[PDB]
Protein backbone atom coordinates (compact mmCIF):
# COMPACT_ATOMS: atom_id res chain seq x y z
CA UNK A 1 0.00 0.00 0.00
CA UNK A 2 1.07 3.45 -1.02
CA UNK A 3 -0.61 6.90 0.02
CA UNK A 4 -0.99 9.05 -2.94
CA UNK A 5 -2.29 11.96 -2.22
CA UNK A 6 -2.92 13.88 1.48
CA UNK A 7 -4.24 17.25 1.90
CA UNK A 8 -5.19 19.31 4.60
CA UNK A 9 -8.96 18.30 5.22
CA UNK A 10 -10.45 22.19 4.81
CA UNK A 11 -9.42 22.79 1.37
CA UNK A 12 -11.75 19.94 0.06
CA UNK A 13 -14.78 20.72 2.77
CA UNK A 14 -14.30 18.18 5.09
CA UNK A 15 -14.68 19.01 9.08
CA UNK A 16 -11.32 17.72 11.23
CA UNK A 17 -11.85 14.37 13.51
CA UNK A 18 -11.70 14.90 16.84
CA UNK A 19 -5.37 11.41 25.94
CA UNK A 20 -5.35 7.46 26.21
CA UNK A 21 -8.08 5.48 27.86
CA UNK A 22 -5.51 3.37 29.52
CA UNK A 23 -4.29 3.97 33.02
CA UNK A 24 -2.69 1.92 35.86
CA UNK A 25 -4.75 -0.26 37.79
CA UNK A 26 -4.47 -1.74 41.30
CA UNK A 27 -1.70 -4.44 40.18
CA UNK A 28 0.29 -1.80 38.34
CA UNK A 29 2.99 -2.21 41.57
CA UNK A 30 2.30 -5.46 42.40
CA UNK A 31 3.37 -7.25 39.11
CA UNK A 32 6.38 -5.99 36.46
CA UNK A 33 5.69 -5.04 32.93
CA UNK A 34 7.80 -2.87 30.28
CA UNK A 35 4.30 -1.74 28.19
CA UNK A 36 2.85 1.46 28.35
CA UNK A 37 -0.10 3.30 26.24
CA UNK A 38 1.08 3.91 22.27
CA UNK A 39 1.90 7.18 21.43
CA UNK A 40 -1.44 9.12 20.66
CA UNK A 41 -0.55 12.62 19.90
CA UNK A 42 2.38 14.13 18.10
CA UNK A 43 3.68 15.99 21.58
CA UNK A 44 4.00 12.78 23.79
CA UNK A 45 7.30 13.31 25.62
CA UNK A 46 8.11 9.76 25.17
CA UNK A 47 8.65 9.91 21.41
CA UNK A 48 12.06 9.75 19.68
CA UNK A 49 10.80 10.06 16.62
CA UNK A 50 8.11 11.76 14.87
CA UNK A 51 4.85 10.66 15.03
CA UNK A 52 3.26 11.49 11.90
CA UNK A 53 5.66 10.21 10.00
CA UNK A 54 5.89 6.95 12.10
CA UNK A 55 2.29 5.98 11.73
CA UNK A 56 2.28 6.17 8.23
CA UNK A 57 5.45 4.32 7.71
CA UNK A 58 4.14 1.25 7.33
CA UNK A 59 2.34 2.46 3.72
CA UNK A 60 5.66 1.04 2.04
CA UNK A 61 4.48 1.26 -1.38
CA UNK A 62 3.21 -1.31 -3.80
CA UNK A 63 4.44 -4.08 -6.25
CA UNK A 64 3.22 -3.43 -9.90
CA UNK A 65 2.39 -6.32 -11.75
CA UNK A 66 0.21 -8.53 -13.07
CA UNK A 67 -1.35 -11.85 -11.86
CA UNK A 68 1.12 -14.31 -12.63
CA UNK A 69 1.21 -17.66 -13.21
CA UNK A 70 1.77 -18.49 -9.45
CA UNK A 71 -1.17 -16.54 -8.42
CA UNK A 72 -3.29 -18.44 -10.54
CA UNK A 73 -2.65 -21.64 -9.66
CA UNK A 74 -2.54 -20.62 -5.65
CA UNK A 75 -5.74 -19.01 -6.02
CA UNK A 76 -7.22 -22.26 -8.23
CA UNK A 77 -5.84 -24.58 -5.54
CA UNK A 78 -7.46 -22.22 -2.84
CA UNK A 79 -10.63 -21.96 -4.27
CA UNK A 80 -11.34 -25.62 -5.02
CA UNK A 81 -10.86 -25.67 -1.15
CA UNK A 82 -13.24 -23.53 -0.50
CA UNK A 83 -15.69 -24.72 -2.82
CA UNK A 84 -16.47 -27.90 -0.71
CA UNK A 85 -18.09 -25.16 2.11
CA UNK A 86 -20.66 -24.63 -0.29
CA UNK A 87 -21.11 -20.75 0.98
CA UNK A 88 -23.92 -18.82 -0.21
CA UNK A 89 -23.27 -15.65 -2.44
CA UNK A 90 -26.75 -14.81 -1.48
CA UNK A 91 -27.06 -11.45 0.46
CA UNK A 92 -27.33 -11.63 4.39
CA UNK A 93 -30.57 -10.60 5.40
CA UNK A 94 -30.17 -6.71 6.27
CA UNK A 95 -31.74 -7.78 9.95
CA UNK A 96 -29.31 -10.61 10.10
CA UNK A 97 -26.45 -8.70 8.71
CA UNK A 98 -27.00 -6.03 11.71
CA UNK A 99 -28.78 -7.57 14.69
CA UNK A 100 -26.86 -10.75 14.86
CA UNK A 101 -27.24 -14.74 13.52
CA UNK A 102 -25.51 -17.84 14.30
CA UNK A 103 -21.46 -17.25 12.88
CA UNK A 104 -22.06 -13.75 12.62
CA UNK A 105 -22.49 -11.25 16.08
CA UNK A 106 -24.18 -8.21 15.75
CA UNK A 107 -22.67 -4.99 14.54
CA UNK A 108 -20.45 -3.73 17.10
CA UNK A 109 -22.74 -0.66 18.71
CA UNK A 110 -20.07 1.29 20.93
CA UNK A 111 -17.41 1.57 17.79
CA UNK A 112 -17.20 4.43 15.55
CA UNK A 113 -20.31 5.22 13.26
CA UNK A 114 -17.35 6.90 10.67
CA UNK A 115 -18.36 9.44 7.70
CA UNK A 116 -20.37 11.54 7.74
CA UNK A 117 -22.02 10.63 11.30
CA UNK A 118 -18.86 11.25 13.35
CA UNK A 119 -19.68 15.25 11.71
CA UNK A 120 -22.88 15.63 12.48
CA UNK A 121 -22.50 13.41 16.39
CA UNK A 122 -24.98 10.48 15.36
CA UNK A 123 -23.45 7.47 16.90
CA UNK A 124 -24.70 4.08 15.73
CA UNK A 125 -27.11 3.79 18.89
CA UNK A 126 -28.81 6.64 17.56
CA UNK A 127 -29.48 4.96 14.42
CA UNK A 128 -29.60 1.10 15.67
CA UNK A 129 -31.51 -0.21 18.65
CA UNK A 130 -30.60 -3.87 20.09
CA UNK A 131 -33.91 -4.21 22.13
CA UNK A 132 -35.87 -2.87 19.21
CA UNK A 133 -33.59 -4.73 16.03
CA UNK A 134 -35.13 -1.45 14.28
CA UNK A 135 -33.98 -0.71 10.84
CA UNK A 136 -36.12 2.09 9.73
CA UNK A 137 -33.69 5.06 10.71
CA UNK A 138 -30.67 3.01 9.11
CA UNK A 139 -32.75 2.33 6.14
CA UNK A 140 -33.32 6.33 5.81
CA UNK A 141 -29.72 6.63 6.54
CA UNK A 142 -28.69 4.50 4.12
CA UNK A 143 -30.76 5.92 1.21
CA UNK A 144 -29.36 9.32 1.97
CA UNK A 145 -26.09 8.61 1.90
CA UNK A 146 -24.91 6.10 -0.18
CA UNK A 147 -22.03 4.02 -0.15
CA UNK A 148 -18.27 4.10 -1.14
CA UNK A 149 -18.18 6.85 2.08
CA UNK A 150 -14.62 7.95 3.70
CA UNK A 151 -13.02 5.79 5.86
CA UNK A 152 -12.23 7.86 9.40
CA UNK A 153 -8.37 6.82 10.82
CA UNK A 154 -8.42 6.25 14.33
CA UNK A 155 -4.75 5.47 16.15
CA UNK A 156 -5.41 2.09 18.18
CA UNK A 157 -5.29 2.98 22.01
CA UNK A 158 -3.55 0.06 23.45
CA UNK A 159 -0.18 -1.55 25.06
CA UNK A 160 3.22 -1.38 23.15
CA UNK A 161 6.58 -2.46 24.24
CA UNK A 162 9.37 0.24 24.66
CA UNK A 163 10.84 0.12 21.55
CA UNK A 164 7.22 0.80 19.80
CA UNK A 165 6.31 3.28 22.07
CA UNK A 166 9.66 5.55 21.06
CA UNK A 167 9.47 4.83 17.96
CA UNK A 168 5.69 6.38 17.84
CA UNK A 169 5.23 2.84 15.57
CA UNK A 170 1.44 3.17 16.80
CA UNK A 171 -1.16 1.38 14.95
CA UNK A 172 -3.80 2.96 13.01
CA UNK A 173 -7.60 1.06 12.35
CA UNK A 174 -9.72 2.53 9.97
CA UNK A 175 -13.54 2.73 10.63
CA UNK A 176 -15.81 2.24 7.92
CA UNK A 177 -19.01 4.28 7.55
CA UNK A 178 -21.90 2.66 8.78
CA UNK A 179 -23.60 2.56 5.66
CA UNK A 180 -20.40 0.58 4.35
CA UNK A 181 -20.13 -1.94 7.26
CA UNK A 182 -23.83 -3.12 6.48
CA UNK A 183 -23.68 -3.47 2.83
CA UNK A 184 -20.14 -5.36 3.24
CA UNK A 185 -22.34 -7.40 5.72
CA UNK A 186 -25.15 -7.80 3.35
CA UNK A 187 -22.62 -9.05 0.52
CA UNK A 188 -19.86 -11.17 2.65
CA UNK A 189 -22.44 -12.20 5.36
CA UNK A 190 -22.69 -15.17 4.88
CA UNK A 191 -19.11 -16.08 3.62
CA UNK A 192 -18.52 -15.03 7.14
CA UNK A 193 -20.77 -16.82 8.82
CA UNK A 194 -19.11 -19.82 7.30
CA UNK A 195 -15.50 -18.94 8.07
CA UNK A 196 -16.19 -18.18 11.82
CA UNK A 197 -18.17 -21.49 12.02
CA UNK A 198 -15.41 -23.36 10.27
CA UNK A 199 -11.49 -22.59 11.77
CA UNK A 200 -9.47 -24.80 10.11
CA UNK A 201 -7.31 -26.44 7.07
CA UNK A 202 -10.23 -26.26 4.72
CA UNK A 203 -10.47 -22.17 5.33
CA UNK A 204 -7.13 -22.18 5.50
CA UNK A 205 -8.91 -19.64 9.05
CA UNK A 206 -8.77 -19.42 12.43
CA UNK A 207 -10.66 -16.12 12.54
CA UNK A 208 -13.42 -16.60 15.26
CA UNK A 209 -12.24 -19.65 17.26
CA UNK A 210 -12.24 -20.32 20.59
CA UNK A 211 -8.34 -21.24 21.64
CA UNK A 212 -9.43 -23.50 24.80
CA UNK A 213 -11.03 -26.01 21.89
CA UNK A 214 -9.38 -25.22 18.84
CA UNK A 215 -5.46 -26.02 19.67
CA UNK A 216 -6.26 -29.75 20.12
CA UNK A 217 -7.80 -29.62 16.94
CA UNK A 218 -4.55 -28.00 15.46
CA UNK A 219 -1.83 -31.11 15.61
CA UNK A 220 -4.55 -33.05 14.16
CA UNK A 221 -5.13 -30.82 10.71
CA UNK A 222 -1.09 -29.94 10.86
CA UNK A 223 0.71 -33.30 10.92
CA UNK A 224 3.58 -32.81 9.38
CA UNK A 225 6.89 -30.71 9.27
CA UNK A 226 5.51 -27.59 10.80
CA UNK A 227 5.81 -23.95 8.69
CA UNK A 228 5.17 -21.09 10.99
CA UNK A 229 5.53 -17.33 10.46
CA UNK A 230 4.13 -13.89 10.50
CA UNK A 231 5.08 -10.55 8.83
CA UNK A 232 5.78 -6.90 10.04
CA UNK A 233 3.21 -4.19 8.69
CA UNK A 234 1.15 -7.19 6.62
CA UNK A 235 -2.13 -4.84 6.16
CA UNK A 236 -0.39 -2.02 4.71
CA UNK A 237 2.28 -3.80 2.92
CA UNK A 238 -0.17 -5.64 0.57
CA UNK A 239 -0.05 -4.51 -2.92
CA UNK A 240 -2.63 -4.28 -5.69
CA UNK A 241 -2.07 -7.43 -7.31
CA UNK A 242 -3.39 -9.69 -4.21
CA UNK A 243 -6.71 -7.66 -3.79
CA UNK A 244 -6.97 -8.60 -7.74
CA UNK A 245 -6.01 -12.38 -6.41
CA UNK A 246 -8.92 -11.72 -3.68
CA UNK A 247 -11.47 -10.61 -6.51
CA UNK A 248 -10.70 -13.67 -8.44
CA UNK A 249 -11.44 -16.31 -5.45
CA UNK A 250 -14.36 -14.31 -4.78
CA UNK A 251 -15.57 -14.67 -8.20
CA UNK A 252 -14.50 -18.31 -8.71
CA UNK A 253 -16.86 -18.87 -5.63
CA UNK A 254 -20.08 -17.52 -7.28
CA UNK A 255 -19.61 -13.69 -6.39
CA UNK A 256 -20.84 -11.21 -9.74
CA UNK A 257 -18.31 -8.73 -10.60
CA UNK A 258 -20.34 -5.74 -8.94
CA UNK A 259 -20.49 -7.70 -5.88
CA UNK A 260 -17.01 -7.51 -5.57
CA UNK A 261 -16.62 -4.40 -6.41
CA UNK A 262 -16.30 -3.76 -2.57
CA UNK A 263 -12.86 -5.39 -2.75
CA UNK A 264 -11.86 -1.89 -4.78
CA UNK A 265 -13.67 0.00 -1.99
CA UNK A 266 -11.06 -1.54 0.43
CA UNK A 267 -7.83 -1.58 -1.95
CA UNK A 268 -7.94 1.83 -2.88
CA UNK A 269 -9.64 4.13 -0.37
CA UNK A 270 -10.13 7.54 0.94
CA UNK A 271 -9.38 8.32 4.37
CA UNK A 272 -10.00 11.02 6.93
CA UNK A 273 -7.11 11.80 10.16
CA UNK A 274 -8.19 14.62 12.05
CA UNK A 275 -7.36 17.87 9.98
CA UNK A 276 -6.00 15.26 7.07
CA UNK A 277 -7.71 13.37 4.23
CA UNK A 278 -5.35 11.21 1.92
CA UNK A 279 -6.11 8.27 -0.61
CA UNK A 280 -4.37 5.14 -0.48
CA UNK A 281 -3.48 2.34 -3.49
CA UNK A 282 -3.03 -0.94 -2.16
CA UNK A 283 -3.23 -1.87 1.76
CA UNK A 284 -5.52 -3.68 3.69
CA UNK A 285 -7.84 -1.10 5.32
CA UNK A 286 -7.76 -2.69 9.19
CA UNK A 287 -11.03 -2.26 10.90
CA UNK A 288 -13.50 -2.06 7.98
CA UNK A 289 -15.92 -5.27 7.66
CA UNK A 290 -13.82 -8.37 6.99
CA UNK A 291 -10.63 -7.35 7.02
CA UNK A 292 -9.39 -10.11 9.09
CA UNK A 293 -10.85 -12.70 6.65
CA UNK A 294 -10.00 -11.27 3.93
CA UNK A 295 -6.57 -10.86 4.73
CA UNK A 296 -6.39 -14.42 5.94
CA UNK A 297 -7.86 -15.44 2.54
CA UNK A 298 -4.89 -13.55 0.96
CA UNK A 299 -2.41 -15.08 2.95
CA UNK A 300 -3.88 -18.07 1.46
CA UNK A 301 -3.16 -17.18 -1.57
CA UNK A 302 0.49 -15.54 -0.62
CA UNK A 303 1.93 -18.45 0.94
CA UNK A 304 0.62 -21.25 -2.00
CA UNK A 305 2.27 -18.62 -4.72
CA UNK A 306 5.54 -18.59 -3.01
CA UNK A 307 5.95 -22.54 -2.19
CA UNK A 308 5.01 -22.65 -6.29
CA UNK A 309 7.54 -20.24 -7.04
CA UNK A 310 9.76 -21.46 -4.97
CA UNK A 311 9.47 -24.97 -5.05
CA UNK A 312 8.77 -26.34 -8.59
CA UNK A 313 7.09 -29.33 -8.00
CA UNK A 314 5.31 -28.58 -4.42
CA UNK A 315 2.68 -30.99 -4.11
CA UNK A 316 -0.69 -28.24 -2.51
CA UNK A 317 -2.27 -31.28 -2.32
CA UNK A 318 -0.30 -32.28 0.98
CA UNK A 319 0.31 -28.58 1.97
CA UNK A 320 -1.89 -27.61 5.27
CA UNK A 321 -2.20 -24.52 6.50
CA UNK A 322 -4.20 -21.94 8.69
CA UNK A 323 -4.33 -18.17 8.80
CA UNK A 324 -5.30 -15.21 11.21
CA UNK A 325 -4.58 -12.47 8.88
CA UNK A 326 -0.90 -12.54 8.95
CA UNK A 327 -0.31 -15.00 11.01
CA UNK A 328 0.35 -18.35 10.26
CA UNK A 329 0.56 -21.85 10.72
CA UNK A 330 1.32 -24.35 8.82
CA UNK A 331 2.78 -27.97 7.39
CA UNK A 332 3.87 -29.57 4.86
CA UNK A 333 5.34 -33.67 4.63
CA UNK A 334 8.94 -32.84 3.92
CA UNK A 335 10.91 -30.02 5.39
CA UNK A 336 10.26 -26.53 3.85
CA UNK A 337 13.25 -23.35 4.07
CA UNK A 338 10.81 -20.91 5.20
CA UNK A 339 13.73 -18.04 5.16
CA UNK A 340 13.26 -18.70 0.90
CA UNK A 341 9.81 -18.30 1.37
CA UNK A 342 10.70 -14.71 2.61
CA UNK A 343 12.72 -13.65 0.68
CA UNK A 344 10.24 -15.07 -2.34
CA UNK A 345 7.64 -12.77 -0.62
CA UNK A 346 9.87 -9.70 -0.60
CA UNK A 347 9.79 -9.89 -4.48
CA UNK A 348 6.14 -9.36 -4.33
CA UNK A 349 6.12 -6.64 -1.69
CA UNK A 350 6.22 -8.55 1.77
CA UNK A 351 7.85 -8.95 5.10
CA UNK A 352 7.41 -11.97 6.07
CA UNK A 353 9.30 -13.06 9.42
CA UNK A 354 9.43 -16.76 10.14
CA UNK A 355 14.01 -25.84 13.91
CA UNK A 356 9.78 -25.76 14.12
CA UNK A 357 8.53 -28.02 16.89
CA UNK A 358 5.63 -28.30 18.66
CA UNK A 359 7.03 -27.21 21.70
CA UNK A 360 8.28 -23.95 20.24
CA UNK A 361 5.93 -22.79 17.83
CA UNK A 362 3.21 -20.30 18.72
CA UNK A 363 0.06 -19.12 16.74
CA UNK A 364 -2.44 -16.22 17.81
CA UNK A 365 0.86 -15.14 20.87
CA UNK A 366 0.04 -18.48 22.56
CA UNK A 367 1.85 -21.82 22.55
CA UNK A 368 0.90 -25.00 22.44
CA UNK A 369 1.44 -27.87 25.43
CA UNK A 370 -0.42 -31.57 25.40
CA UNK A 371 -1.93 -32.06 28.66
CA UNK A 372 0.08 -34.35 30.96
CA UNK A 373 -2.75 -36.44 31.84
CA UNK A 374 -4.91 -36.62 28.56
CA UNK A 375 -2.40 -36.52 25.87
CA UNK A 376 -5.13 -35.58 22.66
CA UNK A 377 -6.04 -32.29 24.56
CA UNK A 378 -3.81 -29.25 24.60
CA UNK A 379 -3.35 -26.04 26.39
CA UNK A 380 -3.44 -22.81 24.77
CA UNK A 381 -0.93 -21.07 26.37
CA UNK A 382 -0.55 -17.26 26.81
CA UNK A 383 2.80 -16.36 28.36
CA UNK A 384 2.51 -15.37 32.00
CA UNK A 385 4.46 -11.70 31.11
CA UNK A 386 1.63 -11.16 28.63
CA UNK A 387 -0.88 -11.84 31.38
CA UNK A 388 1.22 -9.96 33.81
CA UNK A 389 1.08 -6.72 31.00
CA UNK A 390 -2.30 -6.47 30.62
CA UNK A 391 -3.52 -6.84 34.76
CA UNK A 392 -1.45 -3.48 35.09
CA UNK A 393 -3.17 -1.23 33.17
CA UNK A 394 -7.51 -0.58 32.55
CA UNK A 395 -9.73 1.20 30.46
CA UNK A 396 -12.08 1.51 33.04
CA UNK A 397 -11.66 -0.14 36.64
CA UNK A 398 -15.60 -0.71 36.43
CA UNK A 399 -14.36 -3.69 35.02
CA UNK A 400 -11.84 -5.15 36.74
CA UNK A 401 -14.08 -8.35 37.79
CA UNK A 402 -14.20 -9.14 34.20
CA UNK A 403 -10.79 -8.20 32.80
CA UNK A 404 -9.03 -10.10 35.79
CA UNK A 405 -11.88 -13.30 35.20
CA UNK A 406 -10.59 -13.58 31.57
CA UNK A 407 -6.66 -12.97 32.63
CA UNK A 408 -7.66 -16.42 35.12
CA UNK A 409 -8.81 -18.27 32.00
CA UNK A 410 -5.49 -17.63 30.25
CA UNK A 411 -3.25 -17.71 33.11
CA UNK A 412 -4.29 -21.66 34.86
CA UNK A 413 -3.28 -23.26 31.15
CA UNK A 414 0.62 -22.24 32.36
CA UNK A 415 0.37 -24.77 35.50
CA UNK A 416 -0.92 -24.79 39.26
CA UNK A 417 1.82 -23.33 40.86
CA UNK A 418 1.82 -20.56 38.38
CA UNK A 419 -1.48 -20.07 38.61
CA UNK A 420 -1.70 -20.42 42.41
CA UNK A 421 1.22 -17.59 42.24
CA UNK A 422 -1.05 -15.22 40.01
CA UNK A 423 -3.78 -15.43 42.39
CA UNK A 424 -1.51 -15.16 45.44
CA UNK A 425 -0.72 -11.57 43.90
CA UNK A 426 -4.40 -10.46 42.92
CA UNK A 427 -4.94 -11.32 46.47
CA UNK A 428 -2.27 -9.39 47.96
CA UNK A 429 -4.19 -5.85 47.29
CA UNK A 430 -7.54 -5.44 48.75
CA UNK A 431 -9.27 -5.12 45.53
CA UNK A 432 -8.15 -9.09 44.68
CA UNK A 433 -9.86 -10.26 47.60
CA UNK A 434 -13.01 -8.53 46.46
CA UNK A 435 -12.99 -10.64 43.21
CA UNK A 436 -14.80 -13.83 42.15
CA UNK A 437 -11.37 -15.98 41.10
CA UNK A 438 -11.96 -19.10 40.02
CA UNK A 439 -10.18 -22.48 41.63
CA UNK A 440 -7.42 -24.06 39.30
CA UNK A 441 -9.19 -27.21 39.81
CA UNK A 442 -12.59 -25.47 38.48
CA UNK A 443 -10.89 -24.63 35.28
CA UNK A 444 -9.32 -27.51 34.94
CA UNK A 445 -12.91 -29.63 35.00
CA UNK A 446 -14.60 -27.23 32.96
CA UNK A 447 -11.74 -27.49 30.64
CA UNK A 448 -12.04 -31.29 30.19
CA UNK A 449 -15.63 -31.53 30.52
CA UNK A 450 -16.21 -28.75 27.73
CA UNK A 451 -14.83 -31.24 24.83
CA UNK A 452 -17.54 -33.72 26.05
CA UNK A 453 -20.87 -31.87 24.34
CA UNK A 454 -21.31 -29.94 20.83
Not at 106 to 129: C, E, F, M, N, Q
Not at 132 to 161: F, Q
Not at 422 to 439: D, E, H, Q, Y
Request: glycine share 6%; proline share 5%.
Amino acid sequence: GEIEFIESSKDAGFPVINKTKLEPSVFHQVFEGNKEPAVLRSGDPRLKANFEEAIFSKYIGNVNTHVDEYMLEAVDHYAGQLATLDISTEPMKLEDAVYGTEGLEALDLTTSAGYPYVALGIKKRDILSKKTKDLTKLKECMDKYGLNLPMVTYVKDELRSIEKVAKGKSRLIEASSLNDSVAMRQTFGNLYKTFHLNPGVVTGSAVGCDPDLFWSKIPVMLDGHLIAFDYSGYDASLSPVWFACLKMILEKLGYTHKETNYIDYLCNSHHLYRDKHYFVRGGMPSGCSGTSIFNSMINNIIIRTLMLKVYKGIDLDQFRMIAYGDDVIASYPWPIDASLLAEAGKGYGLIMTPEVTWTNVTFLKRYFRADEQYPFLVHPVMPMKDIHESIRWTKDPKNTQDHVRSLCLLAWHNGEHEYEEFIRKIRSVPVGRCLTLPAFSTLRRKWLDSFGSS
